[PDB]
Amino acid sequence: MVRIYTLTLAPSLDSATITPQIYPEGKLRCTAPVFEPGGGGINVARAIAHLGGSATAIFPAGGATGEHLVSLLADENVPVATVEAKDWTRQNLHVHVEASGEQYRFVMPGAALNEDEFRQLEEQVLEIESGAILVISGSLPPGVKLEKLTQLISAAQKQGIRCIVDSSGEALSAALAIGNIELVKPNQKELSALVNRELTQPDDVRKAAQEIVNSGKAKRVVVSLGPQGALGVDSENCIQVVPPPVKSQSTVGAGDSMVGAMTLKLAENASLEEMVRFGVAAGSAATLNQGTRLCSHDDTQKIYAYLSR
Amino acid sequence: MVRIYTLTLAPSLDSATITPQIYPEGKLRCTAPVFEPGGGGINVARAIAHLGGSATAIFPAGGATGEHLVSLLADENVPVATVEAKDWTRQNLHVHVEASGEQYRFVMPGAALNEDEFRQLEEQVLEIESGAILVISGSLPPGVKLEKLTQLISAAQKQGIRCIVDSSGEALSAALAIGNIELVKPNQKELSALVNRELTQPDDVRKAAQEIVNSGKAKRVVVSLGPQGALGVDSENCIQVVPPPVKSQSGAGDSMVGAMTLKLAENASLEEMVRFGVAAGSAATLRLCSHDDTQKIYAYLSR
Amino acid sequence: MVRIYTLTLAPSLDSATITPQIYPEGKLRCTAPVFEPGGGGINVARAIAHLGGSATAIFPAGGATGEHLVSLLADENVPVATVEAKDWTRQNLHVHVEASGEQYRFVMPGAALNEDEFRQLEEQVLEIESGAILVISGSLPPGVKLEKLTQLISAAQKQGIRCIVDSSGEALSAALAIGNIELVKPNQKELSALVNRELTQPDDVRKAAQEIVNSGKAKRVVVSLGPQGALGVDSENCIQVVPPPVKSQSTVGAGDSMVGAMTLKLAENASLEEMVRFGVAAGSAATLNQGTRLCSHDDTQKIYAYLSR
Amino acid sequence: MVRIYTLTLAPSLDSATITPQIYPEGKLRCTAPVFEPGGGGINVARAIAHLGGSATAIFPAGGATGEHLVSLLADENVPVATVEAKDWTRQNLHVHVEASGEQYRFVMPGAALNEDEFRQLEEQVLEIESGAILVISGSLPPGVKLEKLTQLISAAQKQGIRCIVDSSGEALSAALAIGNIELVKPNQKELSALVNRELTQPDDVRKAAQEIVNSGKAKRVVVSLGPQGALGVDSENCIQVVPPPVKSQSTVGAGDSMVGAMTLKLAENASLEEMVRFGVAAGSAATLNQGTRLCSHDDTQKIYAYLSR
Ligand SMILES: O=P(O)(O)OC[C@H]1O[C@@](O)(CO)[C@@H](O)[C@@H]1O
Ligand SMILES: O=P(O)(O)OC[C@H]1O[C@@](O)(CO)[C@@H](O)[C@@H]1O
Ligand SMILES: O=P(O)(O)OC[C@H]1O[C@](O)(CO)[C@@H](O)[C@@H]1O
Ligand SMILES: O=P(O)(O)OC[C@H]1O[C@](O)(CO)[C@@H](O)[C@@H]1O
């Protein structure tokens, strides 16, 4: 099993709180916030840790929020490689409403990154050994041009780093344009935005995903289908996995957990079907917990054994 | 194909309207309502008609709303067998909100049914020949005790009528208690209620469905799972079918029952029944299922 | 006291129902509907009946819904003069939601009125004796042109009929252009449109209302201020009446109840301050209920006695 | 004029952001937060400064957030007396939604205080001179028992400090139990709880307020009635004041501004009539502005001049 790294250009110190209900104007009494390390690549690395693997999270940390974020990852035993940033790590607020079981996510802009700080991040990424896997996950922070991310991916691939991209539509498109992306995970809206067409016919999603693989843009495409699970295709196989009919507490950490689970299997050189089933198991497991808590090992394992019957 | 009948103890004259936004207290301006036939069994009959089958809907019709309802089904070429009732047929309101694309469904109670009207409905049911299929679908109106429905199922079964039940709560429990129900289609909550336990484990839904079948209460249980499709079980087999990842808006449940009923009338396999049911349910959510949409999805599922 | 009549070009058979909560897509279970006679002028006449007065409601009634509407007015001791109409009387749905305590009100278009049917209504109006008061209230139905409504008001005034108008902004502006309207009840938005200017300074509402009276367009203007009650002005006096500090359950019936109360007082040749106080008492009383019941005699008298201290 | 101080046991660094839409589950893209000083007593001191008076805000401040809060009050030229606290000052979130114009207010628990910090706060209070006014306003931090609040009030009163209390519920009831509170400002619901009965009749609010005054628990009770203004009573008089029909946009900041205004009037030995009018003027002026903005001098004076004609 090869080494895994993640890159989070816009980390977040997430605070999760609970409040009886949600309405305008009045003071909504919230519980003392629970702090959790956030941001795409970081969540990916935490999920992998939860699942008994290891991934090194590369990211910029700034200010006390930054230090707080780093301290939490230490507690969760997630290895990090950090770059000191001037701008403070952002704080995003997640509000779980008891009355409705709904969760609301207020996502501020990522901390700015200056050209020098980005260079250091690039430096860390290019110290990655050939054949290792790099997951680039989360939004692009203010100050970072799309071209620079594109060049970084090209440089990384040039020295054998195997790249997974889960980000904005623009970054997604740009990454596929470089081609040979190990894995991408668009949802249906994102897939439609990618190929510029409505996916209305039964076979449309598969055809769109397969087209992306066949043109060499990505080696694997796993379309996230919400409650309908996931449809994954590579050059040879195609599989749709539907999650079991279980609870439904907090829909939020499903995506990053899925990517973490799939990356873990990718690292172990597993089959497409193992990868997709493990990804759906983990994403589903995540919905059993609060948003900021990702998948747990035991739940993932149980759902995976079931999905694999 | 055996003959097919449906029974709707609580029909509805459905009205649909459109309004810009939804908020409290203010007068929400709505477009002139549009009317269509409603009620579980009636929708089942309509779905079957869209799918090229024939089903006779048996139901009480009362007052001018009932007359409206009957006339609508006339224009739709759906065969009916009505009983004249005193209490006027209910009128439910479906509101489409432009700003959000959301739909709101206000469902009044079914019109009351006295003993004499139920009697007429029951005799209409017992006119059905042995081996035919009867779909009892929709809520139970006031003035109708569970025992009356129960005794109607027993009477129907005694003379060879094959009974499908799609209702909720006590009515469904009541039906299964009599047992030998050809098919029931609970959702996960209703299933949980029927077996009196939370269904949280991956295999919990299948086990609960299987428990109902094994007890002899139903021959087939098809658990509706919303966007996840359906899981079907019988004494011998289990099948789970997920729709294709096409578009959604919702008349799925009545269409699915209609589709599965047609298939049962054609002596289909469990697999064919559930696939066609899921196809029709999905087609309806692209209004009931159309023929071409249902066939297109069914073909894909049946590849 | 002179006799009172009302004119409702768009009656409504209101059905009132209750449901535990309101959310989209799902079947919302509502209680067996309760039916009330509805529509502007009809509600005015009902309020007047509740308050111990008598007002004959003139309106088109069509179909079984129209018959039901007529039967209900009989039960409330409201004298009627009806014209048979081809199109069936509309049915509006009022839903009270238990969990929130709020109401949602789905208002369909008024039934269509034929020219021949309008002619019959106009004929009923022009049989009213000189010196009597006519309240024209509610939206205009399809098939009725604004110019027809203004011509009716002109013809009415020509034979000594004292006209009160409560309608849409456009209808309101139209009636005022005719002028000599006994009373109008615009809200602040409408009032601002009428005088074509923003009302932003403390004295602006009063000045705007006074302007309408001074032009001869209306004899009295009573500006509805929601929770702040009403500000009434005539050629000589000005008064603002605020409702008592009690809970308001709804506000739909307030408008029509207020107009009914003020009309009654006008028929009794009461003072401006009596008129406005009685109007706010009746409006306030109406807001105590969920909507379609309007002001009760006892609530109004209690509130009126309080306000008149 | 006697000197004015305020006490905020639970200050807040108020963050505010803008987002186009609000709905569950999805990532709501918010703008980089803007900040302002927060907490009951702090806002009271801020309103007082706007109104031309001077009030010193006494409060705990912890961590970088505490420093941020202090800095912002410095930027507004508001006098403060702070105690350095170990637990970081809470950060509340105000969210404005563009699609709807609505605002959402997420109010976290106040930072905890230890024995030493609370002792320092009390020492600051008991350095206030006899005859001066102290406004204790806002929620109680977890860990600070009611008995601690009431002990503080009893001590302050012992050396002639005149105490005004704006809090809710149990804290207000406890304060009233000590008695001789110069001023309290319950809303109708709070008042109903204070006297343990539903206030349904027109004169019930006045009676309930008068009961509290008559008992000697408070010298003055001003009941805030939202858009209907306020009803104030003392041992001698009663007055209800409704604001002018000005345009309201955001109710937030109305309560604190109102307290600030009435406290300033009290410091000037104002009549009950002057005090309630100025409070309503300030409350009204605050709600003229969108967001969390407090009363301005010019808006308040304009409205008060009108009310005082
Ligand atoms: O006259 P409109 O604007 O069409 O609204 C009619 C609705 O309002 C009342 O007229 C209330 O004002 C109702 O009883 C009714 O259903
Ligand atoms: O004192 P509470 O109830 O915790 O509320 C604090 C909130 O109210 C203000 O004190 C407004 O009253 C704010 O600035 C703030 O964030
Ligand atoms: O990467 P984005 O689009 O800026 O969103 C960040 C949010 O998503 C997570 O990365 C969840 O996906 C969070 O912990 C977080 O606050
Ligand atoms: O049988 P129920 O539960 O009273 O629901 C009736 C509603 O559902 C349909 O039966 C759709 O299922 C309608 O046409 C209708 O108005």
From Swiss-Prot, chain B:
Its EC number is 2.7.1.11. Substrate binds at residues 12-14, 27-29, 39-43, 90-92, 139, 254. Mg(2+) binds at residue 190. Gene3D superfamilies: 3.40.1190.20. One of its GO terms (biological process) is DNA damage response. GO terms for cellular component: cytosol. InterPro entries: Carboh/pur_kinase_PfkB_CS, PfkB_dom, Ribokinase-like, Tagatose/fructose_Pkinase. Pathway: Carbohydrate degradation; glycolysis; D-glyceraldehyde 3-phosphate and glycerone phosphate from D-glucose: step 3/4. K(+) binds at residues 250, 284, 287. Keywords: ATP-binding, Glycolysis, Kinase, Magnesium, Metal-binding, Nucleotide-binding, Potassium, Transferase. It is an enzyme of class 2 (transferase). ATP 2 binds at residues 27, 187-189. The active site is at 254. Changing residue 190 to Q: Causes a 50-fold decrease in the kcat value and a 15-fold increment in the apparent KM for ATP. Allosterically inhibited by ATP. Allosteric ATP-binding requires the presence of the substrate ATP. Inhibited by monovalent cations with ionic radii larger than Na(+) (e.g. K(+), Cs(+)). The monovalent cations increase the affinity of the allosteric site for ATP. PFK-2 is sensitive to inhibition by fructose 1,6-diphosphate. It catalyses: beta-D-fructose 6-phosphate + ATP = beta-D-fructose 1,6-bisphosphate + ADP + H(+). SUPFAM superfamilies: Ribokinase-like. ATP 1 binds at residues 27, 185-187, 224-229, 248, 278, 282. One of its GO terms (molecular function) is ATP binding. Its cofactor is Mg(2+). Catalyzes the phosphorylation of D-fructose 6-phosphate to fructose 1,6-bisphosphate by ATP, the first committing step of glycolysis. Belongs to the carbohydrate kinase PfkB family. Homodimer. Only 10% of the activity present in the wild-type strain is phosphofructokinase-2. This is ATP-dependent 6-phosphofructokinase isozyme 2. It comes from Escherichia coli (strain K12).
